[PDB]
């Protein structure tokens, strides 16, 4: 595998209706991380995110917590979803940067957000972080900050796409 990375990790390859997939989105040996803006798209006529209490979301939910991004370190969590279209943009960032750097300890592999997704068809589908004008220096639809709140320009792969019931593409 790439030594740095971001990836959208499934924790299924296959679902029948009615069951959830949870998406985990992983980053990997990512130097002095400390917060990302993602763009990601399902399509919303076979995927449908819930909270993890069931919930579906609105415009400003954001996804559920992951292992790493928990830390009081004053975290700002935005996000500003489209559910008709199948786009959830997020923000997740510590504020506190003077003391996350004085902790030294930085955050540069784990799971910093999860998305779970009722499975409303069984067909192929995709789930992928994808370019948007709302946000013009994005890598393939992700972007990374570093501890000083400068931009992680280069150096990491956007493993893509994750995909649920990719046994069934034929048929799509």
């Not at 292992?67 to 004053?74: V, Y």
């Not at 931009?151 to 990491?156: C, D, E, P, V």
């Given at each position: 595998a790439p030594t740095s990375s971001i990836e959208i990790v499934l924790d299924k390859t296959t679902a029948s209706v009615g069951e959830i997939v949870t998406a985990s989105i992983n980053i990997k040996n990512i130097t002095n991380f400390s917060g990302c803006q993602l763009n990601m798209k399902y399509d919303p006529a076979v995927l449908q995110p819930v909270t993890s209490s069931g919930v579906a979301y609105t415009k400003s939910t954001m996804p559920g917590a992951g292992?790493?991004?928990?830390?009081?370190?004053?975290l700002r969590q935005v996000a500003d979803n489209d559910l008709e279209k199948g786009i959830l943009n997020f923000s997740k960032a510590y504020v506190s940067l003077d003391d996350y750097r004085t902790?030294?300890?930085?955050?540069?592999?784990?799971?910093?957000a999860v998305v779970k997704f009722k499975v409303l068809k069984e067909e192929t589908s995709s789930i992928s972080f994808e370019d948007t004008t709302s946000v013009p220096n994005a890598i393939d639809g992700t972007v990374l900050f570093d501890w000083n709140g400068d931009?992680?320009?280069?150096?990491?792969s956007v493993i893509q796409p994750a995909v649920i019931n990719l046994d069934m593409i034929k048929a799509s």
């Open positions: 292992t790493i991004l928990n830390s009081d370190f004053n902790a030294a300890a930085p955050e540069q592999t784990g799971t910093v931009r992680i320009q280069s150096g990491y």
